[PDB]
Amino acid sequence: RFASVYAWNRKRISNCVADYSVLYNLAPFFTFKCYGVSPTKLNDLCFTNVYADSFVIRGDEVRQIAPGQTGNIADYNYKLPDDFTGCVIAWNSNKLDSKVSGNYNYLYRLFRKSNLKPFERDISTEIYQAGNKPCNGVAGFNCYFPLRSYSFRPTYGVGHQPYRVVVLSFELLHAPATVCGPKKSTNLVKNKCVNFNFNGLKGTGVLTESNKKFLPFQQFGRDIADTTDAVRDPQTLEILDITPC
Amino acid sequence: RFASVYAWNRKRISNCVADYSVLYNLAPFFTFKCYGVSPTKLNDLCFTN
Amino acid sequence: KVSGNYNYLYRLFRKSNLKPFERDISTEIYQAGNKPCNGVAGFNCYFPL
Amino acid sequence: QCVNLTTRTQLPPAYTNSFTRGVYYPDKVFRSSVLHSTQDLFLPFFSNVTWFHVIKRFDNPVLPFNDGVYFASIEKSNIIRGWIFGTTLDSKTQSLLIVNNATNVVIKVCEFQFCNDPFLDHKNNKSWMESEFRVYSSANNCTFEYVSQPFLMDLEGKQGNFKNLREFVFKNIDGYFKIYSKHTPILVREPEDLPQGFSALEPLVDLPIGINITRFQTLLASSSGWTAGAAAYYVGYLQPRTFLLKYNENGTITDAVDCALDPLS
Amino acid sequence: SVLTQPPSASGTPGQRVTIPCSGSSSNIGNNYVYWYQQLPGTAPKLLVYGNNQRPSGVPDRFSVSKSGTSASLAISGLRSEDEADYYCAAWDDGLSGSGWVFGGGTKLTVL
Amino acid sequence: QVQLVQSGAEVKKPGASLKVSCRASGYTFTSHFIHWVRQAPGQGLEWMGIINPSGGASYAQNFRDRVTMTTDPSTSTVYMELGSLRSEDTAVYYCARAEGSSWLGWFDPWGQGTLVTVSS
Ligand SMILES: *[C@@H]1O[C@H](CO)[C@@H](O[C@@H]2O[C@H](CO)[C@@H](O)[C@H](O)[C@H]2NC(C)=O)[C@H](O)[C@H]1NC(C)=O
Ligand SMILES: *[C@@H]1O[C@H](CO)[C@@H](O)[C@H](O)[C@H]1NC(C)=O
Ligand SMILES: *[C@@H]1O[C@H](CO)[C@@H](O)[C@H](O)[C@H]1NC(C)=O
Ligand SMILES: *[C@@H]1O[C@H](CO)[C@@H](O)[C@H](O)[C@H]1NC(C)=O
């Protein structure tokens, strides 16, 4: 059961090992395009937070979820921000959603007084006003019901089957991590030039011990030139110090 | 006189600027519903004929 | 009109569903049966207008 | 507790100059001994912060919300509990209820409908209990629900010498609600205005509401004469500004400058 | 019209005759394919359906296989009753519509 | 035991109307989708469309705008109404059932076949 486009459900995902291999192997995909990351390089980075949206839209409008578009599903229902990260996984689902009798359980908003900033929601269904004199009771002339139902049939071609859509959005390397792909820890060493991979932050140097106090809501220190030079060991809670060979 | 149902008249409308706002501001109008596009944005669409 | 405007007619019986967007009127009399009849009303003959 | 009363002696709220309060950590990365320039929504230096006092007089009006609010409370008897956020507050649109009285900080985004002022005088009679807990007549359908550890509590009642000074900033950016908190104890400023000091707030929660909010009113808890703890809360509005912030050697903020007030600045 | 089939087929009794059906991603590249056999003055019957199971009442000598994006049906032990027209069916989806397209057909007979 | 019966049809003038019935017995009528198919002489096969036993129906887009469905889940009958015929649509029609889930499935029942033609 996927949501309607105008009342989409956003889900948290935290404290788990994320493997996208069991996902990208799905042959019947029709689209897998990523903006800030590449689809094949998602198995070595740890994300601060992951949110997985969901809705079902008509096949013609699957191109409209990308940032910077406009229309009746990109300004009145669900609008992505201009600086989007993460990526969208869209695939045809004509077998499940569509029905021969005519599926009538998917709505979308048509009339709104003004647009909406990204990632906003509106369950309100008060009658839209178009004329000078407000109406009441039932809608009609100069005032309309804001929601109209999709009509899905298996007859219609591409552009009218429902493409199920799920969108993953995640901030990259600004906070303590909770979710990322499998890896094998390799102990810890000090005062020996090594190749450290701390939560996806590659580099090279020697890791001494430091006495600078980290506030509880911080993980990475920085210096003038905007380069990380103090990290918190993910397993223990020691504060290290990265300096070049 | 309007044409009857069996011989409804067809008129060609093109190469003109159509302002539906003045039409919409009439008194005795009773029923007005639209299907193809939103009836509140009829002044921003361009068609061949 | 109070006196009666009887210049509008509509069709009751037709041979089959008309092609959408047609502007052709046929004065042929409709026949319920296969045998053609014309002139006065007779067996299985009735006016469809 | 819901009785038609009217007789709203809505005294006009007063003015004060919010000297330097309301600044916060903008980025979650450690720094030390450097000056950093940020561009955010800040409470301008020396702005007409609006002061409300709750004691014969009593008020809690609905105030506008426009791009974040700085809320500073001086209170000892624990009389101001929570907040309500919304656009119409009439059960037709989603709204936030934030309450942190006794059990846990509860944040609920749902359809809510509200009465005027549920109480008798403040509470009957001297011990807390459960009474008319149905502060919601109903709630059709809603999504968000959050519970967490409560903030600092107040024990017993004290008149004057209000050591507690709470200050919060609420900011709404792109479907995210950011609440930054800071509790400064031992305040001996008996006369009136907020102290001439400095305190940078710390992040407390950053959570995905994704709704539309425009107005909020604070939530607070016989012939003549009554004992009630006096509460003084100040409200200020935030503007898009650029600040220059100083971090000392320990990684904490000492002072900041606003680059638009004074040509010296 | 999208489905391509040999115009006709033939073979001596006792031989093995292979019939192909080549489509595309829309027709065969995603879903199952069916094979249908039609006899003169008879209703259509079933030869292979689901591509991994054979119906009841039919000999299993009708060998079937999928070669990438094509279907192949091989027949051994040819007899007189084998003379029939063969079609391949596959639910197809297109940019203008979608349907239950049948194959062009292939007339299989012996002189 | 299980078999579908149709209506014998004869010559029809071009542009006429055809009402073809399909009566099924020996199984639960309101459990299987219905496929109607049309075969033209000197050509392959083309399925007319798909019908729910109790509800609406769906049609191939090429053959839409001229075919009409009505259902009656009381005496177990399914009807085609066809209009705006031409001399090139003379063919044979079959009414058949399918698996209860439609699409991918087994088609054991089949239509007896009814012929439509134009001649004088
Ligand atoms: C959030 O809600 C408020 C109030 O419902 C909206 O404010 C409206 O703004 C438009 C344009 O400025 C005005 O025409 C309306 O009169 C305002 N509403 C009221 C009740 O006065 C605001 O637009 C909403 N947010 C969004 C993104 O639409
Ligand atoms: C009751 O409420 C109404 C609100 O319209 C107010 O006018 C009236 O004065 C109230 N009655 C009393 C006794 O306060
Ligand atoms: C700010 O407060 C001062 C002091 O009363 C007053 O003179 C001034 O008009 C106020 N400005 C605004 C914008 O309210
Ligand atoms: C409860 O106490 C309040 C004051 O604290 C008083 O106004 C009210 O009348 C009391 N109610 C009862 C039932 O004693």
Task: Write the CATH number for E53.
Answer: 2.60.40.10
Q: How far is Cα A22 from Cα A89, in angstroms, rounded to an integer?
A: 14
For residue F97, give the 3-state DSSP assignment: strand
Chain E residues lying within 8 Å of F103, measured CB to CB: 91
For residue A103, give the 3-state DSSP assignment: strand
Write out chain E in H/E/C secondary structure.
CCCECCCEEECCCCCEEEEEEECCCCCCCCCCCEEEEECCCCCCEEEEECCCECCCCCCCCCEEEEECCEEEEEEECCCHHHCEEEEEEEEEECCCEEEEEECCCEEEECC
Pocket of ligand 1 from Cβ distances under 6 Å: A 113-114, 116-117; D 87, 212, 214
Nearest CA to ligand 3 atom 10: D48
What domain range includes position E83?
Answer: 8-109
Write out chain D in H/E/C secondary structure.
CCCCCCCCCCCCCEEEEECCCCCECCCCCECCCEEEEEEEEECCCCEEEEEEEECCCCCCCCEECCCCEEEEEECCCCCEEEEEEECCCCCCCEEEEEECCCCCEEEEEEECCCCCCCCCCCCCCCCCCCCCCCCCCCCCCCCCEEEECCCCCCCCCCCCCCCCEEEEEEEEECCEEEEEEEEECCCCCCCCCCCCCCCCEEEEEEECCCCCCCEEEEEECCCCCCCCCCEEEEEEECEEEEEEEEECCCCCEEEEEECCCCCCC
Q: How far is Cα D83 from Cα D218, in angstroms, rounded to an integer?
A: 5
For chain F, the straight-line distance linking the first and the last C-alpha, in angstroms and rounded, comes to 39
List the determination method: cryo-EM
D36 touches D25 (CB < 8 A): no
Cis peptide before D125 (omega within 30 of 0): yes
For residue F6, give the 3-state DSSP assignment: strand
Nearest CA to ligand 1 atom 9: A114
Q: What DSSP character marks residue A217?
A: T
Q: How many CB atoms sit inside 10 A of residue F60's CB? A: 19
Could you identify the atom of ligand 3 that is nearest to the CA of residue D48? 1
Is E23 inside a domain boundary?
A: yes
D203 touches D180 (CB < 8 A): yes
* CA proximity to A180, closest of A56, A50, A47: A47
Residue carrying the six token digits 């991979």:
A197
Tokens of D64: 């506008």
For residue A61, give the 3-state DSSP assignment: helix
> CA–CA distance from F58 to each of A153, A161, E27, F91 (Å)?
7, 14, 20, 21
Q: What is the dihedral of CA A216, A219, A224, A227, to 10 degrees?
A: 180
Could you identify the atom of ligand 1 that is nearest to the CA of residue A116? 27
Q: How many CB atoms sit inside 10 A of residue D162's CB? A: 22
Of D3, D6, D7, D116, which is best to mutate to test ligand 2, by the most ligand atoms within 8 angstroms of its C-beta?
D6
Tokens of B47: 């068609």
Q: How far is Cα C29 from Cα F52, in angstroms, rounded to an integer?
A: 39
Q: How far is Cα D191 from Cα D77, in angstroms, rounded to an integer?
A: 19
Contact A130/B29, CB-based, under 8 Å? no
F71 touches F78 (CB < 8 A): yes
Contact F110/E55, CB-based, under 8 Å? no
Q: Give the chain F residue whose CA is nearest to the CA of A156.
A: F61
Kindly tell me whether chain F and chain B come into contact, counting contact as 3+ Cβ pairs under 8 Å. Answer: no
Q: How far is Cα B41 from Cα A115, in angstroms, rounded to an integer?
A: 14
Provide the CB-side half-sphere exposure for A192 (13 A, CA).
3
In B, what residues contact A, Cβ < 8 A? 29-32, 38-40
Q: Is the CB of D222 under 6 A from ligand 4?
A: yes
Mutation pick from B38, B41, B42, B43 vs chain A, by most beta carbons of A within 10 Å, is B38
Mutation pick from A94, A99, A100 vs chain F, by most beta carbons of F within 10 Å, is A100
Residues in a beta bridge with D181: D168, D202
Residue F108: CATH number of its domain: 2.60.40.10
**Burial (CB count <10 Å: 0-12, 13-18, 19+), residue A221:** buried
Q: Which ligand is nearest to the Cα of residue D44, counting in written order? A: 3
Q: Is the CB of D17 under 6 A from ligand 3?
A: no
Q: How far is Cα A214 from Cα A212, in angstroms, rounded to an integer?
A: 6
Mutation pick from C1, C23, C25 vs chain B, by most beta carbons of B within 10 Å, is C23
CA F49 to chain centre: 8
**Cα D87–Cα D93–Cα D96 angle in degrees, nearest 5:** 70
Contacts of D44 (CB under 8 A, 6+ apart): D239, D241, D258, D261
- Which of A117, A119, A213 is facing D251, going by the closest CB pair? A213
Q: How far is Cα A244 from Cα B14, in angstroms, rounded to an integer?
A: 74
**Burial (CB count <10 Å: 0-12, 13-18, 19+), residue E105:** buried
Contact F17/C20, CB-based, under 8 Å? no
Q: How far is Cα F109 from Cα E87, in angstroms, rounded to an integer?
A: 18
For residue A206, give the 3-state DSSP assignment: strand
Q: Give the chain E residue whose CA is nearest to the CA of F36.
A: E100
Q: What DSSP character marks residue A140?
A: B
Of D125, D129, D222, which is best to mutate to test ligand 4, by the most ligand atoms within 8 angstroms of its C-beta?
D125
- Amino acid, res. D123: K
Counting the structural domains of chain E, the total is 1
Tokens of F119: 């001649």
Tokens of E10: 């033939």
Q: How far is Cα F16 from Cα E110, in angstroms, rounded to an integer?
A: 42
Counting the structural domains of chain F, the total is 1
Provide the CB-side half-sphere exposure for E8 (13 A, CA).
7
Q: How far is Cα A34 from Cα A21, in angstroms, rounded to an integer?
A: 15
For residue C46, give the 3-state DSSP assignment: coil
* CA proximity to A119, closest of A73, A84, A80: A80
Could you identify the atom of ligand 1 that is nearest to the CA of residue A114? 28
The phi, psi pair for F103, rounded to 5°, reads 55, -125
Nearest CA to ligand 1 atom 27: A116
Q: Does E94 touch chain F (CB under 8 A)?
A: no
Map out the domains of chain D with their CATH numbers.
14-265 (2.60.120.960)
Q: What DSSP character marks residue A25?
A: T
| Touching A: D residues 178-237, CB under 8 Å | 202-203, 208, 210-212
Q: What is the dihedral of CA D114, D117, D122, D126, to 10 degrees?
A: -40
Contact B8/C23, CB-based, under 8 Å? yes
Q: Is the CB of D137 under 6 A from ligand 4?
A: no
Residue carrying the six token digits 């019966």:
F5
Is E61 inside a domain boundary?
A: yes
Contact A158/E95, CB-based, under 8 Å? yes
Nearest CA to ligand 1 atom 14: A113
Tokens of A217: 């809501």
E88 touches E69 (CB < 8 A): no
Q: Give the chain A residue whose CA is nearest to the CA of B29.
A: A141
Q: Is the CB of D124 under 6 A from ligand 4?
A: yes
F37 touches F46 (CB < 8 A): yes
Could you identify the atom of ligand 2 that is nearest to the CA of residue D5? 14
Residue D97 Cα to ligand 1 middle (Å):
21
What domain range includes position F35?
Answer: 3-116
Write out F47-87 in H/E/C secondary structure.
EEEEECCCCCEEECCCCCCCEEEEEECCCCEEEEEECCCCH
Q: How many CB atoms sit inside 10 A of residue F35's CB? A: 22
- Amino acid, res. F37: V
**Burial (CB count <10 Å: 0-12, 13-18, 19+), residue F22:** buried
For residue F2, give the 3-state DSSP assignment: coil
